[PDB]
């Protein structure tokens, strides 16, 4: 058999379906004939409307007690998460490391993030 | 790329594991450089 | 192998976004492509007569500079002025060719040593 | 997409380079190249031969670096959004440091120039030294430079349009137009009244026309290049840094002319 | 904004108040006495009784500590703890002066 | 291993071998350093016999070897090459074999220094390069363009790497930091990378046409020719003052965190401080001429020249304020780098207010050329840059390698190098406002009993160096043993007085910074998943 | 001609460092490394004469 090229984001699965097929003959290559890996990726997903590579800001929205700890997902089995506040900026900044196994608490807010890990590596 | 890591892993030389001394190497590099400038003062005074 | 291996977590793909980027794109071009016939009409409308009278001024003098070095290559050696302090200074000769010539040194206009 | 699928990839745009030999390789190359010109300037050496080798490794140590930076860039595809914008920046900064050099020269010309030494004459050129016309050679290299930027964004939106034959062509007439720049530029050297080492006019005229001239050389071949990845499909329509570096930099070179020219030609005679 | 005294007052009875478990309760002891105020003893007592919520003696301990600490006269430490004198007593912490005896 | 360290193109490897280069070279810069200080003991030739020109060739040997080769690597290149992608959360920096270029283009201009060293005669035109002392006519010989071709080498260096450090913390950011929450020696590196980037073009033009005039006959500085050597000096110092802004900046970056982290408290007004190390950094450019107040400049540019210099003692000011403000009300937890914080405090105010007595045209008179500018120069760069180097080192080393340091050892390394600092730098304000030249190997013997003292000094200040090579020894085979006896300090924030001892070892690191939660020696590419900040 | 993705397809799928992955790669690569360490042994070499004062005969 073959790969495909993997036309939108539910399609692809590996690195060697994001290569697509080249330009014709005397035309100039568009983005989505020739662009291969991350970068087709990040192609697709722009066409999709999904941005990959998530730049959202840690949710500070509330204040996150043990029993109701504010999730944030991570692909590792922890990540780092600097807290200032219960709003954005409220005390300085307060770098913390959630893992799988141990909450995080913040110390200045009591501010408690759970990690919640993807994973499958 | 996956190299190792850990508390050896992060620097250049050989410190553990290891058939010489490591103080040997680990004085040696910088008595060498404390000798550069005697060396440049031989050759211009041999000069 | 995990539970969290199969749990699409992407969001929806149906913002405006979308349809703003590939819009976008078109805009992009649709616009590039008439800017580009407005540099046609200004490449070939003002570059090509510009290029070509200031080509023949060009040859002009530069035909009467190849006759003024041609008739400055008759000249005799004590004819040649009086080359100045600041002119043509050896502080320690070249390390190419011989010595006393430089890298696109003209023998006919700079004969001073 | 799912989590396994998702879980694959980079997480973060930003390019993680593979191990290669090319930093210490031009490294190596560069010492060389001081050590040989230091000993071949002072006679150590015999012939200019040890310059001229390295000189050459120098040069091919730098090719086959951007050898691997178009094959990341193309056929492993690194460069993404975040990479583009970063690699657009980092040209930018290298620009505005060449422009800074350009801004020593012009602080050299403007000091031996607005004070005229006793010895030269207490004029400006000194006495002796009849200074290039502006209107006859280097009034044509301005305007073919002009004309090159105008090529350049016409065929550069010739590029994103899609049209591959007018975007081919404004880039192969633009290379054609500054190696025309370079060859009026060697005949200027070469049919010149003075020398470098005719005083400060010499010295700090020729060293600013020739860190110029190298400019534009280095230019040209980034116009081949750039010509040659066109020509073999590397470009696409919304996919080129090759490009856009090299048009800012045609356009930087043109300014940078435009000064010159002005300064050394219209204020120096 | 600045805080008024009294809305500081306010504001770490209602934390104290709210605190429940013992990082909780040592964190808002910790931002409590680092201000430049030594609390007024009702935040004192509500901090003693949630120390006593959650069921550890020596934070309530340490709250005499470091108003031992805090406090910027040796007089005034005793206008405290004579003024939480049934409320030390109700608990039954002691001092750490009189805890190790030297 | 051969690819990880020859071929490497990831930061922290990079960081380490820019710190290993400057470190070897900062030890050659202290033994040409002792040498100077031993030849200038007592008047007549001691140790060098005769040879005036051996003993200038080592004078700028140790300027331009503790300048751009210990100082400068180890500042810029080891500190922002570990630290700059880690505390902003960068995965690895952008351009990395830009990053390799740098470090392994460092070397080589340790090497042809050195062979300018070996060959003929030797540079001996000071640090300063200046015409005609440095053209053809004086210096022979193929030494001075070995000298120029290093000063080129640790140029492309110092460019490149601020071009990398310029568009990593630009582009590279993690996805909570806006540009007003960075740290301050994130914000340090920057201003630096740019005060770098607009300097070294003027560096390389003043330079090269220096290399111009020695092998290519022309005239740019030869006065037979009509060329002027106060272009030299305009040039060459519109590099220099941005240098020593360059060189100092990143210790304001460093001090600002040993501070707020051995205080216990953030630091006073952040903002005002990324303001002030800008502000600092945009008038540096203008004050340039203040070292050519000798040369003839005209009075009313010498009277904009000192208030131009004098208006950079207020951003000075108020960094060195609000750093007491950061110490004062907090709890001191005094190791090693809190000590090397207070005496980088007090030392550095000395040396600047001796640079505020130096910038005033009409003393510049009595002071041009004498100790006295070296001993504000060498106290601005000797504890502003070496006092923060060992801030950084004994600060961030635990973390970066792993392994904790004998701290007893690191303290009696700390006063020995205060009281020798001290006991070195202070006689020679002395020499100097006596009147005392600068770069001679032989004085009249009225200078004598301060060269005594000082010459005494320089032995304390290089056992303090034997001393800190070996905790470097110490701290490589023992840290595993140091971290589980008490011969160290293994937390570096005790708990508060209210913190149970359990409820501190869950939460064991308290920092306003990424680095210090990070594993002792951190991954090779951490950052999977990009660290996210509200 | 257009072999960006026969190129990108023997590029990817390659356990090769990046400077060999191409078919014309030791075409290169191999009097590269020869020029190289000659352009790097010769002016090394040439380093005692340098510090001795032997001068380069001119014949
Ligand atoms: C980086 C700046 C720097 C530093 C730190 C020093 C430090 C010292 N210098 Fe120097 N010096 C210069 C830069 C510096 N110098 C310059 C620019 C000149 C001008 C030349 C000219 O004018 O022509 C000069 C000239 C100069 C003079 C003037 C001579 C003259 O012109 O007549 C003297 C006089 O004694 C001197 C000696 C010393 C001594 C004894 C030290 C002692 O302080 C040595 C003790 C220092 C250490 C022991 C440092 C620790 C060692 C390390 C390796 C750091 C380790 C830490 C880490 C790696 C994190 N040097
Ligand atoms: C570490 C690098 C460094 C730094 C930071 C400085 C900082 C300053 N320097 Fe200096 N300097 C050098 C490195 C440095 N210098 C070198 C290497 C030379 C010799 C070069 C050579 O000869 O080759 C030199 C020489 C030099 C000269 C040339 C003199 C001469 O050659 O004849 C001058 C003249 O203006 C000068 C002045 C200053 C001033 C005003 C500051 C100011 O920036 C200092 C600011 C700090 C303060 C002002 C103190 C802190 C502020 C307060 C405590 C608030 C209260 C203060 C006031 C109200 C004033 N120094
Ligand atoms: C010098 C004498 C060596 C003798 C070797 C004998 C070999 C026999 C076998 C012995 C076992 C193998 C030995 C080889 C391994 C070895 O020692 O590493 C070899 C290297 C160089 O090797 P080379 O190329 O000169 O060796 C020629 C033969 N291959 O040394 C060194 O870098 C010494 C470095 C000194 C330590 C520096 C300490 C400071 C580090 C600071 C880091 C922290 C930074 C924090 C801030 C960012
Ligand atoms: C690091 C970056 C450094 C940046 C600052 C560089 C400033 C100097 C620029 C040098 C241009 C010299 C030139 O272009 O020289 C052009 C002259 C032209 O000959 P002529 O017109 O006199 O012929 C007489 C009749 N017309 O060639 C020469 O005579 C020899 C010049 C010296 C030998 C070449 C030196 C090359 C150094 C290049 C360094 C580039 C980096
Ligand atoms: C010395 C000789 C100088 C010759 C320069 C040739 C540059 C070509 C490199 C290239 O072409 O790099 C291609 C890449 C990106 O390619 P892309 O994404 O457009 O590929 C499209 C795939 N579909 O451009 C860059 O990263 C930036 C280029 C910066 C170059 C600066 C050169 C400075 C040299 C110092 C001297
Ligand atoms: C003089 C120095 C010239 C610097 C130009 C840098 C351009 C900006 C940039 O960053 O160009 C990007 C490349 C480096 O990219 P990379 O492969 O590290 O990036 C990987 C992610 N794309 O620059 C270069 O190839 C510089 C090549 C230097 C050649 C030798 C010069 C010696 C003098
Ligand atoms: C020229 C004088 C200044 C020189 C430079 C200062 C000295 C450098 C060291 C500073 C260390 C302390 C800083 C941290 C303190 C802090 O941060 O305090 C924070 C407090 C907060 O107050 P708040 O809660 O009411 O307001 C909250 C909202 N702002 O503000 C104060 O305390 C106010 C202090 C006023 C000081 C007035 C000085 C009066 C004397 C002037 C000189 C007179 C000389 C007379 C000689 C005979
Ligand atoms: C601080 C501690 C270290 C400082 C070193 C001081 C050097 C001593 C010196 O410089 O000694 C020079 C003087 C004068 O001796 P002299 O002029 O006869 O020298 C002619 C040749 N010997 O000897 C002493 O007075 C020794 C007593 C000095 C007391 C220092 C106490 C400091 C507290
Ligand atoms: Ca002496
Ligand atoms: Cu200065
Ligand atoms: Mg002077
Ligand atoms: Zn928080």
Redesign the interface.
């Known amino acids: 058999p073959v790969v495909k090229t993997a036309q939108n984001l539910a399609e692809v699965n590996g690195p060697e379906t994001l290569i697509g097929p080249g330009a014709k003959e005397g035309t100039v290559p568009t983005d989505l004939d020739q662009e291969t890996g991350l970068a087709r990726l990040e192609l697709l997903g722009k066409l999709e409307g999904i941005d990959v590579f998530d730049t959202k800001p840690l949710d500070s929205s509330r204040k996150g007690t043990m029993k109701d700890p504010i999730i944030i997902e991570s692909y590792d089995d922890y990540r780092y998460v600097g807290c200032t506040g219960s709003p954005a900026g409220s005390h300085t900044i307060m770098w913390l490391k959630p893992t799988v196994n141990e909450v995080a608490r913040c110390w200045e807010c009591g501010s408690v993030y759970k990690l919640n890990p993807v994973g499958v590596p | 790329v996956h190299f190792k890591d850990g508390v050896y892993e992060n620097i250049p030389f050989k410190v553990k594991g290891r058939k010489t001394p490591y103080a040997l190497s680990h004085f040696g590099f910088f008595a060498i450089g404390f000798a550069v400038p005697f060396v440049a003062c031989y050759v211009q005074l041999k000069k | 192998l995990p539970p969290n291996a199969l749990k699409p977590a992407f969001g929806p793909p149906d913002k405006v976004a979308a349809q703003k980027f590939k819009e976008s794109l078109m805009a992009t071009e649709k616009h590039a492509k008439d800017t580009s016939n407005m540099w046609v009409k200004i490449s070939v409308w003002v570059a090509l007569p510009a290029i070509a009278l200031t080509a023949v001024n060009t040859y002009f003098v530069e035909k009467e500079h190849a006759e003024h070095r041609e008739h400055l290559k008759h000249v005799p050696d004590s004819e040649w002025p009086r080359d100045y302090e600041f002119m043509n200074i050896r502080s320690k000769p070249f390390f190419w060719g011989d010595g006393d010539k430089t890298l696109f040194w003209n023998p006919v206009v700079n004969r001073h040593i | 997409?799912?989590?396994?699928?998702?879980?694959?990839?980079?997480?973060?745009?930003?390019?993680?380079?593979?191990?290669?030999?090319?930093?210490?390789?031009?490294?190596?190359?560069?010492?060389?190249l001081?050590?040989?010109?230091?000993?071949?300037?002072?006679?150590?050496?015999?012939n200019?031969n040890?310059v001229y080798?390295?000189l050459?490794?120098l040069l091919?140590?730098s090719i086959?670096?951007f050898?691997?930076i178009v094959?990341?860039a193309?056929?492993?595809?690194?460069?993404?959004?975040?990479?583009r914008?970063?690699?657009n920046?980092?040209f930018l900064?290298?620009v505005?440091?060449?422009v800074?050099?350009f801004?020593?020269?012009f602080?050299?010309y403007f000091?031996?120039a607005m004070?005229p030494?006793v010895?030269?004459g207490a004029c400006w050129p000194?006495?002796?030294?009849e200074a290039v016309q502006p209107?006859?050679?280097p009034?044509?290299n301005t305007?073919?430079l002009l004309?090159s930027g105008?090529?350049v964004?016409?065929s550069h939106?010739?590029?994103?349009?899609?049209?591959?034959?007018?975007?081919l062509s404004g880039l192969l007439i633009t290379f054609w137009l500054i190696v025309i720049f370079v060859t009026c530029q060697?005949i200027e050297?070469?049919?010149?009244?003075?020398?470098?080492?005719?005083?400060?006019?010499?010295?700090?005229f020729?060293?600013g026309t020739g860190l110029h001239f190298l400019h534009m050389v280095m230019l040209a071949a980034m116009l081949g290049v750039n010509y040659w990845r066109m020509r073999?499909?590397?470009?696409?329509?919304?996919?080129h840094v090759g490009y856009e570096t090299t048009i800012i930099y045609t356009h930087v070179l043109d300014v940078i002319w435009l000064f010159l020219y002005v300064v050394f030609y219209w204020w120096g005679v | 904004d600045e805080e008024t005294f009294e809305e500081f007052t306010a504001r770490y009875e209602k934390e104290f108040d709210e605190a429940y478990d013992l990082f909780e309760v040592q964190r808002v002891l910790n931002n409590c006495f680092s201000y430049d105020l030594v609390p007024a003893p009702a935040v004192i007592e509500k901090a003693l009784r949630a120390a006593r919520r959650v069921n550890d003696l020596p934070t309530a301990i340490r709250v005499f500590e470091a108003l031992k600490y805090k406090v910027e006269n040796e007089d005034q430490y005793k206008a405290y703890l004579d003024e939480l004198k049934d409320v030390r007593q109700e608990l039954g912490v002691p001092l750490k002066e009189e805890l190790f005896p030297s | 291993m051969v690819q990880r360290w020859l071929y490497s193109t990831n930061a922290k490897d990079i960081a380490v071998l820019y710190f290993m280069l400057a470190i070897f070279s900062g030890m050659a810069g202290t033994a040409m350093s002792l040498i100077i200080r031993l030849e200038l003991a007592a008047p007549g030739s001691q140790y060098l016999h005769g040879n005036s020109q051996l003993f200038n060739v080592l004078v700028v040997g140790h300027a331009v070897l503790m300048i751009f080769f210990l100082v400068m690597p180890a500042l810029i290149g080891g500190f922002g090459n570990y630290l700059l992608p880690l505390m902003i959360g960068a995965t690895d920096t952008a351009f990395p074999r830009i990053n390799n270029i740098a470090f392994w283009v460092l070397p080589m201009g340790l090497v042809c220094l050195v062979t300018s060293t070996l060959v003929e005669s030797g540079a001996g035109t000071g640090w300063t390069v200046y015409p005609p002392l440095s053209s053809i006519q004086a210096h022979s010989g193929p030494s001075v363009d070995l000298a120029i071709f290093a000063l080129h080498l640790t140029s492309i260096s110092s460019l490149l790497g601020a071009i990398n450090f310029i568009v990593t913390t630009l582009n590279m950011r993690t996805n909570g930091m806006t540009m007003h929450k960075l740290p301050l020696f994130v914000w340090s590196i920057f201003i630096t990378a740019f005060l770098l980037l607009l300097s070294l073009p003027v560096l390389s033009a003043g330079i090269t046409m220096l290399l111009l005039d020695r092998n290519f006959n022309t005239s740019f500085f030869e006065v037979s020719g009509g060329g002027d050597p106060i272009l030299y000096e305009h040039l060459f110092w519109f590099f220099g003052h941005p240098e020593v802004y360059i060189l100092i900046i990143p210790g304001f970056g460093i001090i600002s965190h040993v501070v707020s982290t051995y205080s216990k408290k953030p630091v006073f007004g952040e903002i005002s401080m990324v303001y002030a190390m800008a502000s600092i950094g945009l008038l540096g450019f203008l004050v340039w001429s203040h070292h050519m107040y000798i040369v003839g400049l005209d009075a009313d540019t010498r009277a904009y020249f000192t208030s131009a210099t004098m208006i950079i003692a207020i951003p000075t000011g108020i960094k060195i304020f609000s750093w007491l403000a950061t110490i004062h009300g907090g709890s001191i937890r005094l190791a090693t780098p809190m000590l090397y914080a207070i005496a980088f405090l007090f030392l550095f105010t000395m040396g600047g207010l001796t640079g505020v007595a130096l910038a005033n045209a009409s003393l510049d008179v009595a002071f041009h050329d004498t100790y006295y500018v070296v001993g504000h120069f060498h106290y601005v760069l000797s504890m502003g840059a070496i006092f923060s180097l060992f801030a950084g080192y004994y600060y961030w080393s635990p973390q970066i390698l792993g392994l904790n340091y004998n701290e007893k050892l690191a303290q009696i390394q700390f006063w020995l190098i205060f009281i020798g600092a001290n006991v070195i730098f202070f006689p020679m304000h002395f020499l100097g406002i006596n009147g005392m030249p600068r770069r001679i190997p032989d004085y009249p013997d009225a200078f004598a009993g301060w060269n005594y003292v000082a010459s005494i000094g320089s032995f304390i200040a290089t056992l303090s160096l034997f001393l800190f090579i070996y905790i470097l020894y110490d701290q490589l085979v023992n840290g595993l043993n140091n971290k589980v006896n008490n011969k160290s300090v293994i937390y570096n924030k005790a708990p508060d007085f209210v913190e149970s001892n359990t409820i501190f070892n869950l939460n064991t690191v308290k920092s306003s910074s990424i680095e210090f939660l990070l594993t002792s020696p951190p991954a090779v590419h951490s950052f999977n998943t990009p660290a996210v900040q509200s | 001609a257009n072999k960006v993705i026969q190129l990108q397809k023997i590029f990817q799928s390659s356990t090769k460092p990046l400077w060999w992955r191409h078919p014309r790669s030791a075409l290169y690569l191999y009097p590269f490394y020869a020029i190289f360490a000659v352009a790097v042994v010769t002016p090394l070499l040439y380093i005692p004469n340098a510090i001795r004062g032997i001068k380069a005969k001119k014949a």
Do not use: C
């Open positions: 997409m799912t989590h396994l699928e998702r879980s694959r990839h980079q997480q973060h745009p930003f390019h993680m380079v593979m191990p290669s030999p090319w930093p210490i390789v031009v490294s190596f190359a560069l010492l060389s001081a050590l040989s010109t230091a000993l071949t300037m002072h006679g150590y050496i015999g200019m040890m080798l390295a050459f490794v091919t140590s086959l670096w050898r691997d094959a990341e193309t056929y492993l595809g690194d460069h993404t959004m975040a990479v914008k970063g690699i920046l980092g900064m290298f505005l440091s060449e800074l050099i801004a020593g020269l602080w050299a000091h031996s004070s030494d010895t030269l000194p006495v002796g030294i209107t006859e050679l009034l044509l305007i073919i004309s105008a090529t964004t016409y939106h010739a590029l994103i349009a899609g049209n591959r034959n007018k975007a060697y050297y070469t049919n010149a009244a003075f020398t470098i080492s005719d005083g400060v006019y010499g010295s700090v020729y060293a073999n499909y590397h470009l696409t329509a919304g996919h």
